[PDB]
Amino acid sequence: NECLGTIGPVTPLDASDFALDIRMPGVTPKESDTYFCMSMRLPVDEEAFVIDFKPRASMDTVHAMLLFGCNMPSSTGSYWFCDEGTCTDKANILYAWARNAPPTRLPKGVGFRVGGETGSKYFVLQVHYGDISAFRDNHKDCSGVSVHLTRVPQPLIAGMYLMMSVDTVIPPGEKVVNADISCQYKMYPMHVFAYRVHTHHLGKVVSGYRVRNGQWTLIGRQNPQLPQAFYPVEHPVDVTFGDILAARCVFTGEGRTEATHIGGTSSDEMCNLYIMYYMEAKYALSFMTCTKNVAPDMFRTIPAEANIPI
Ligand SMILES: [Cu+2]
Ligand code: NI
Numbered sequence: 001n002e003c004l005g006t007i008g009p010v011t012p013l014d015a016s017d018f019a020l021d022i023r024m025p026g027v028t029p030k031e032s033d034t035y036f037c038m039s040m041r042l043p044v045d046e047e048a049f050v051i052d053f054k055p056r057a058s059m060d061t062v063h064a065m066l067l068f069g070c071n072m073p074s075s076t077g078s079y080w081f082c083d084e085g086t087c088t089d090k091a092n093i094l095y096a097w098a099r100n101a102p103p104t105r106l107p108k109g110v111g112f113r114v115g116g117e118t119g120s121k122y123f124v125l126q127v128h129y130g131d132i133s134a135f136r137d138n139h140k141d142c143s144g145v146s147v148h149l150t151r152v153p154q155p156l157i158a159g160m161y162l163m164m165s166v167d168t169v170i171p172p173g174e175k176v177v178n179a180d181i182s183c184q185y186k187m188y189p190m191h192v193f194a195y196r197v198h199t200h201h202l203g204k205v206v207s208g209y210r211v212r213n214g215q216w217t218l219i220g221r222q223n224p225q226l227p228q229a230f231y232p233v234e235h236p237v238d239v240t241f242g243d244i245l246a247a248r249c250v251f252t253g254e255g256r257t258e259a260t261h262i263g264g265t266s267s268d269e270m271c272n273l274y275i276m277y278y279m280e281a282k283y284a285l286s287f288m289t290c291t292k293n294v295a296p297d298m299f300r301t302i303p304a305e306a307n308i309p310i
Contacts, residue, residue, distance in 0.1 A: 002056060003142035010043055017150045018043075022067065022125045023056070025078050026140030029129050033063075035082035039073040040123045044151070047116030050158075051106065052148035053095045062143050063130035064227065065097040069112070069120030082126050083264075092120060092287055093160060093274055095145060096196055098227035099130075107193060110278045111154040113286060123147070157284035158276060159190070163208065163247045165271035166291045170202060170260040174253035178307075179271040180299050182246045183290035185239050188283035192237040194230040194276040195220035199249055200269050202260060204309040208247035208273050209302075210239050216246075216303050219275060223310060224249075230276055239277070244295055247273045248306050 009021040022040045029036070042048070057065060070087030074080065094112055097103060114120050125144055135141075165179040197206035203224035210217040219237055239245065249271035253260065260269050279285070 001058065009040065016152045017148065019146050019148050021056070021144060021146050022123050023142045023144035024125070024127055026142055027079055028135060028138055028140055029132065032130065032132055034129045036079055036127045036129065037075070037082040037086060038079040038125055040125070042115045042121055044115060046151060047119060048114055048149045048151050049111035049154045050094060050114055050147055050149055051111040051154065054146040055097045055103070056144050056146060057097060058141065058143050059099070060134045061129055061131070061141070063099055063128040065128065065143070065145060066093060066126040067095040067145055068093055068124045068126070069114055069122065070124060071121045073122050073124055086124050086126060090287070091124065096229045097145070098229035101227040101229045103229050104194065104232045106158065107278065109154060110156040110158050112158045114149070119286070153281065155281055156278045157281055157286065158278050159284060159286045159288070161190070161245065161275040161277060161288045161290070163245065163273040163275065163290045165249065165262055168262050168269065168271060170251050170253045170269060172253050172256040172259050177251045177253060179249040179251065180246070180293050180296065181248070181271070181273070181290055182244055182293050182295045182298065184294060185241060185243045185245055187241070187285060187288070188279060189238050189240045190277035190279050192219055192233050192239065192275050192277045194232055196228055196230045196274040197222045197224045198228050198270055198272040198274070199224035200266060201225070202251045202253070202269055203271070204250045204252055205306070206247065206249045206271065206273055207306040208245065208275060210237055211244040211246055211298070214301065216301065218303065218305070221305060230274070244298070245290060246295070246299065246302070248299070248302065250307060250309065
């Protein structure tokens, strides 16, 4: 079932363009909710641009998939469990496939720059397998993602503005805990075209806004318990020098004996909001982070919807 062997992962389209198949190397899981990770080096050492993703997911088994970019994977193995870790350095997300939430295409002219001196040398593919019902026959699985690379330089460059809580603590029982993140945007204009939220099972609602002279332009709002793909932004949102990116995850503490804090495990929590943007080639940077809350009181003027779960 859909597994190349003798043809390999690389597939020339044209001189410049080519397609690359990041697949699992015939793994079979033992247990449910298993996170498998494997890496692919880039075939070229020159800078390239990623411009498309086709999900190749066997529908009767794969919960979700993620693709990152980094310079140093965690394992040197053929595959590994992602609890060991994805990338030792900063792992940069590019694509998120979710079952039951069809992903959107990248806008035309937009590509993530990869490789070269500065960009990512590796891809790491994280596959989340749900149930084991279809593996009764013990068949090796080759699920993954074909990607479209090219050396033709693209007019617009994709990047990611990661907003995350670092020092949150949820007291057990506590009915409502907000996790507020805010930073002054400090670069050339970006335009936001997608977003993903990630929390674990206590996340009620994550929301993120651009605030320009006091008024709260919404970017994205989602219940993290819904499938965590990138979702499209209604009308693309520019974000200019001086603007403030605010975001608020909202957590409950109920159904918990001890206090929850930020971390990797299932017992711990996360408040990540990934805002995919594009910038003009000449002005572009590929990654931005915000772990602060530089404008804390400002969250009184927050919209209501941010605190209203659905
Ligand atoms: Cu997490
Ligand atoms: Ni605009």
